[PDB]
Write a protein that holds these residues in place. Sequence first.
Motif, short mmCIF file in Angstrom:
data_model
loop_
_atom_site.label_atom_id
_atom_site.label_comp_id
_atom_site.label_asym_id
_atom_site.label_seq_id
_atom_site.Cartn_x
_atom_site.Cartn_y
_atom_site.Cartn_z
N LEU A 80 10.64 2.94 -0.31
CA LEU A 80 9.50 2.26 -0.90
C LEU A 80 9.35 0.89 -0.26
CD1 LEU A 80 7.44 2.22 -3.36
CD2 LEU A 80 9.21 0.83 -4.49
N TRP A 81 8.21 0.64 0.38
CA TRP A 81 8.00 -0.65 1.02
C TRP A 81 7.66 -1.74 0.00
CZ3 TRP A 81 9.93 -3.53 4.18
CH2 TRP A 81 9.30 -4.69 4.64
N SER A 82 7.94 -2.99 0.37
CA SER A 82 7.99 -4.13 -0.55
C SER A 82 6.63 -4.52 -1.13
CB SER A 82 8.60 -5.35 0.16
OG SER A 82 9.81 -5.00 0.82
N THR A 83 5.55 -4.04 -0.53
CA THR A 83 4.21 -4.29 -1.07
C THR A 83 3.88 -3.29 -2.18
OG1 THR A 83 3.26 -2.92 0.68
CG2 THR A 83 3.26 -5.31 1.05
N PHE A 84 4.82 -2.39 -2.47
CA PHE A 84 4.59 -1.36 -3.49
C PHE A 84 5.60 -1.44 -4.65
CE2 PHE A 84 1.36 0.69 -1.01
CZ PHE A 84 1.74 0.55 0.31
N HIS A 85 6.13 -2.63 -4.90
CA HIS A 85 7.12 -2.80 -5.96
C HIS A 85 6.56 -2.68 -7.37
CE1 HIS A 85 10.63 -4.89 -3.61
NE2 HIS A 85 10.35 -3.68 -3.16
N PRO A 87 5.25 -1.30 -10.53
CA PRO A 87 5.65 0.02 -11.02
C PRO A 87 4.56 1.07 -10.85
CG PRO A 87 6.21 -1.67 -12.62
CD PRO A 87 5.40 -2.35 -11.56
N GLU A 88 3.30 0.66 -10.95
CA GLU A 88 2.21 1.63 -10.88
C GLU A 88 1.92 2.05 -9.44
OE1 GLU A 88 1.69 -1.57 -11.61
OE2 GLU A 88 0.09 -2.26 -10.28
N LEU A 89 2.54 1.37 -8.48
CA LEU A 89 2.33 1.72 -7.07
C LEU A 89 3.41 2.66 -6.53
CD1 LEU A 89 1.31 -1.86 -5.82
CD2 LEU A 89 -0.18 0.02 -6.53
N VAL A 90 4.51 2.80 -7.27
CA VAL A 90 5.68 3.50 -6.75
C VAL A 90 5.42 4.99 -6.47
CG1 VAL A 90 8.04 4.22 -7.18
CG2 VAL A 90 7.35 1.88 -7.78
N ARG A 91 4.90 5.71 -7.46
CA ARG A 91 4.66 7.14 -7.25
C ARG A 91 3.62 7.44 -6.17
NH1 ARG A 91 4.75 12.36 -11.20
NH2 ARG A 91 3.85 13.85 -9.70
N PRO A 92 2.46 6.78 -6.22
CA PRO A 92 1.48 6.99 -5.16
C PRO A 92 2.07 6.70 -3.76
CG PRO A 92 0.48 5.83 -6.98
CD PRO A 92 1.95 5.87 -7.27
N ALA A 93 2.90 5.67 -3.66
CA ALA A 93 3.56 5.36 -2.39
C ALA A 93 4.40 6.55 -1.93
CB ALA A 93 4.43 4.11 -2.52
N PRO A 119 0.85 -6.87 -3.03
CA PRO A 119 0.24 -5.56 -2.78
C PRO A 119 -0.91 -5.71 -1.80
CG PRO A 119 0.52 -5.94 -5.14
CD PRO A 119 0.84 -7.23 -4.45
N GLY A 120 -1.07 -4.76 -0.88
CA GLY A 120 -2.12 -4.87 0.11
C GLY A 120 -2.05 -3.81 1.18
N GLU A 121 -3.02 -3.83 2.09
CA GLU A 121 -3.11 -2.84 3.15
C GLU A 121 -2.04 -3.09 4.20
OE1 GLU A 121 -5.64 -0.52 2.92
OE2 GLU A 121 -6.83 -1.46 1.32
N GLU A 122 -1.90 -4.35 4.60
CA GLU A 122 -0.92 -4.75 5.62
C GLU A 122 0.50 -4.62 5.10
OE1 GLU A 122 -2.41 -5.22 8.80
OE2 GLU A 122 -2.26 -7.41 8.91
N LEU A 123 1.44 -4.33 6.00
CA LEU A 123 2.85 -4.27 5.65
C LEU A 123 3.33 -5.67 5.32
CD1 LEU A 123 4.25 -1.88 8.38
CD2 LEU A 123 4.06 -1.44 5.93
N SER A 124 2.82 -6.63 6.07
CA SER A 124 3.24 -8.01 5.92
C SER A 124 2.03 -8.93 5.83
CB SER A 124 4.14 -8.42 7.08
OG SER A 124 5.25 -7.55 7.16
N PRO A 125 1.34 -8.90 4.69
CA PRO A 125 0.19 -9.76 4.40
C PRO A 125 0.53 -11.24 4.56
CG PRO A 125 0.34 -8.05 2.75
CD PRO A 125 1.58 -7.93 3.60
#
Length: 315
Positions: A80-85, A87-93, A119-125
Amino acid sequence: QCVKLNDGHFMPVLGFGTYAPPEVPRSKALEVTKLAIEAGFRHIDSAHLYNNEEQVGLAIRSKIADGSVKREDIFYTSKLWSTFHRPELVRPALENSLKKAQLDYVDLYLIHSPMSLKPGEELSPTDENGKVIFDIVDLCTTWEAMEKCKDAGLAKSIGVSNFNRRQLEMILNKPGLKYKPVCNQVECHPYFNRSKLLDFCKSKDIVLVAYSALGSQRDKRWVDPNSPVLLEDPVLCALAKKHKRTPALIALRYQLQRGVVVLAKSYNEQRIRQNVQVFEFQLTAEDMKAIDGLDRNLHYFNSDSFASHPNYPYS
Ligand SMILES: NC(=O)c1ccc[n+]([C@@H]2O[C@H](COP(=O)([O-])OP(=O)(O)OC[C@H]3O[C@@H](n4cnc5c(N)ncnc54)[C@H](OP(=O)(O)O)[C@@H]3O)[C@@H](O)[C@H]2O)c1
Ligand SMILES: O=C(O)c1cccc(Nc2ccc([N+](=O)[O-])c3ccccc23)c1
Ligand SMILES: O=C(O)c1cccc(Nc2ccc([N+](=O)[O-])c3ccccc23)c1
């Protein structure tokens, strides 16, 4: 050669590292993952971060189709990448990783890092001043979401990566914890052997998984070019001569005999095939103590910026 995780599943003690810098064509990941499986690797380590899950998944698909392996023979890790921490982003990720790799489940899903990002499109906003944008997230809530992914059958096991003892304990002591992390994947090699953290992990039945076990890829983005080259260490080289193996094999075997699960990245067919030879020889107990003496508390990965992250693992 597997270790039994604290949730009952089994992890091959030797894993294939798949990260390659952006300048390496994505087709290579496909090609080298096939070679790794061909050479005998069954544990394969990837991540959303690596921009290669599609290629790694295809290599696996390919090797199942030609009859070399079955899905249940492969141990596939995503993270799980750090922009998806949140809780609601975890499963979709996770579902996106699964779609990418065209897999039904990952054998292991990790929180890649405790250092949460916006949270965002870029890995490293980055912000208007070009600094990467941090986020504040209670990692216990992220973990709760991870537990739900294991119950959803999308991840056979769940664990963490780049956590220190404190952060691990924050999870282990969480009220109503359902699943302990089966592992903690961290930087681990003779110049940073993590013995104290390893001991703790053992006492909690958590596997320590070693990365940069061969001294890292020394990427200029994070590694001081003046840091010592691990595989040029005189002690390791002297041990390589003694056993008539290579410094790399000395490094990997070290981890195996400390009860650590060890990763090894190589995009070279002959080094890939060399690395599986780790099961062919033993280091003496005296060899092991000798290598223990190399510790320099040296993490190859550095970041002035993230050193200030509230969740920076190295204090
Ligand atoms: N969770 C995390 O934050 C994190 C961080 C870093 C890594 N990892 C994972 O761990 C994997 C490995 O760690 P790493 O990427 O830092 O690389 P590594 O395993 O330390 O390997 C570093 C270099 O060793 C070389 N090598 C491999 N086998 C060799 C041999 N037998 N003799 C001589 N040289 C050899 C490879 O070059 P060649 O390709 O030319 O063979 C590779 O670039 C990564 O791919 C990734 O999957 C995770
Ligand atoms: O943006 C990219 O394309 C990109 C690509 C690869 C790596 C990173 N950076 C990092 C990945 C993972 C961790 N980490 O804790 O796991 C990091 C920690 C500190 C600094 C950078 C990290 C960014
Ligand atoms: O997963 C990969 O293969 C991968 C690839 C590239 C970079 C990283 N980066 C990093 C991981 C972890 C820590 N860390 O704090 O533990 C880092 C710290 C500073 C800079 C980079 C870091 C990981």
